[PDB]
Structure 1
Amino acid sequence: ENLLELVANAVAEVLGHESAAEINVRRAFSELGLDSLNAMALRKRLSASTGLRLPASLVFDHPTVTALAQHT
């Protein structure tokens, strides 16, 4: 639950947002705006922060931000 803020600020950084808090937790990635290799940039940011692996299927595993509890 502590990494939710990490995920939110990583998403804001990769998407160009500055508030890092005005992001709908329960919303699809497409509605919030996303493209191709933005996912791999987010994966690199998570690997730098969390240190976990890069399954590359996490985006389609759970598009909603509120379902980002798969870490660890």
Structure 2
Amino acid sequence: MGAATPAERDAILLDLVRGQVAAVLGHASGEDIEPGRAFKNLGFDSLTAVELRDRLGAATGHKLPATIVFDYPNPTALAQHLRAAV
């Protein structure tokens, strides 16, 4: 995604995090997750946080901090940090 605008980056990373959260949740819709909703409210313990981080690390081909999910509470926030990370 070098041939993509900032807003386009925002959208691809937001589609990535929402898809990965849905897989951890098991809904698997990938659009069911609300970008504003905090991970705590969605049904997230510490174990679900590191599973999300593993999936995002795999998908982005980067190594991420284990606390990244806790530190950026919503999918939008995590997507926005991942713009800085990649």
TMscore range, shorter length: 0.7 to 0.9
Amino acid at match of 1:11: V
* Unpaired runs of at least 5, structure 1: none
Percent identity over the alignment? 53
Q: Distance in 2 between matches of 1:10 and 1:34?
A: 13
Higher RCO (CA-CA < 8 Å; seq separation 6+): 1
* Unpaired runs of at least 5, structure 2: 1-9
TM-score by length of 1: 0.86
Task: Give the alignment's Cα RMSD to 1 decimal.
Answer: 1.2
- Bigger Rg, which one: 2
Q: In the alignment, what sits opposite 1:52?
A: 62
CA 1:37/1:11 → structure 2, altered by over 3 Å: closer, same or farther? same
* Structure with greater helix share of residues: 2
Q: Which runs of 4+ in 1 moved over 2 A?
A: none
TM-score by length of 2: 0.74
